[PDB]
């Protein structure tokens, strides 16, 4: 009904040849860089798009930078193309061989247009990854926290031993090191029940007005570990898919 | 001549009996809450410093807490002993066999003071370890960078392939997703040298008024790479030394 607005939006393929046209001439009049990886090839190289004709079904690239990218063109090879419009990831294959032509004097790369082009905002994925959104909620109670109300905070982090936390404001002194709390939760997708936990690191950044904690989970259950390492793998897979970089 | 404010701080061992006196005497005074680590025991336990006298050479620690505990003290067994005072860990070891005993009505487990005590401030890596903090400094310019003066900023995050970075204010207009800046750099004890990055991620924060970056290493020679690996082995192990709370 709503999309929070802080969750990640996956990728949307452009089928029909009036998007994928509006998509490419778009890159060509705002002379957004592209990037051109080669299938085999570990230097990529750099173009822009210089002409986008639906009638005649024409995109043209612009001369390679470095130079030297051009004998790939002349080899036939198979590349992917990227460029970003308005901060959105456009991408699409070249499967095929181009024609070397000229337009307005300068070299440039033919062929047919793509019947299919990719259309990603990525900015929420990379402020999760980032650590600023899509925070596990967490609560942070015990006999021993001073003041009331159980706190409410952020997962950071979390591992097999231990987690690391985030607070709003300044909560340093509510706490104390090395004491066990025996009243922790985690939100979903994490969905862990009353935990303990010992204090172990504490530290409040006056600048961004927040107090960060180091936790170690103490005597965990066996259902807890197994929740716990679970996220712990998941989270990993998540992380090395962004960082991979390919959609 | 100084240390610089946020560099971590090694630990202390205290050797001498006055000083060693004095750290327990502290933590029996303002009540610091002990955690027990036994050789070969999953489950750690609490406990106080509640009684200190250097004349007789008795150091008494409280009853433990879960009470189950006890037969680990009655078995002989060795365990660390943990707490923390005005924000320093104070850490010994047991090697030996207590006496259990009473003082002030509540049963209490005694021996001789320990011959070393050690004394660590961690917050310097804490801080650093939430990358607050000991950051190595880069630059990014190059000729499609808008604006005048090459920007200086922070590495927060590095790998094979790329690297995530920090800039104060917005510096988003003057950046461009997609596109190739061909002078990185990266100060100590990184030293890397005019690389060239493609810009994959941009986002700033306002809440903190911090933009954030994503780059790609761009066509990376070999001497670089084995820079940027080495870097990221030497990271990962003092990540893996610091999650084992163990000093």
């Known amino acids: 009904m709503f999309n929070e607005s802080d969750a990640p939006q996956p990728p949307k393929v452009l089928s029909t040849p009036l998007e994928i046209a509006a998509n490419l001439r778009q890159l060509q009049e705002s002379h957004d860089p592209l990037i051109i990886t080669f299938h085999d090839r570990s230097h990529r190289f750099q173009s822009y798009v210089v002409h986008v004709d639906r009638e005649s079904n024409t995109l043209a690239l612009d001369e390679m930078i470095p130079r030297d990218g051009e004998k790939f063109i002349e080899n036939g090879e198979h590349f992917r193309v990227e460029g970003f419009h308005d901060g959105v990831r456009i991408a699409w294959e070249c499967d095929h061989a181009l024609k070397i032509s000229e337009v307005d004097g300068h070299r440039c790369y033919s062929g047919p247009l793509p019947q299919e082009v990719t259309y990603h905002q990525r900015r929420n994925a990379f402020r999760a990854a980032l650590k600023l959104s899509q925070l596990v909620d967490i609560i942070l109670d015990g006999a021993h926290l001073k003041g009331n109300g159980a706190m409410r905070g952020k997962l950071l982090d979390i591992s097999a031993t231990g987690c690391k936390l985030r607070f709003e404001g300044n909560v340093e002194d509510r706490l104390q090191l090395g004491q066990v709390y025996e009243r922790f939760k985690a939100g979903n ?4 029940v009353d935990t303990m936990v010992e204090l172990r690191h504490l530290h409040y950044e006056e600048r961004i007005n927040t107090t960060f ?17 679970s996220f712990v793998y998941q989270l990993q897979r998540e992380a090395r898919r962004f960082d991979k970089d390919d959609y």
């Not at 997708?189 to 862990?192: A, D, S, Y």
């Not at 904690?213 to 390492?229: C, D, M, P, T, Y």
């Open 189 to 192: 997708p994490l969905g862990l």
């Open 213 to 229: 904690a180091g936790v170690r989970f103490h005597n965990l259950s066996g259902q807890a570990q197994r929740k716990i390492e």
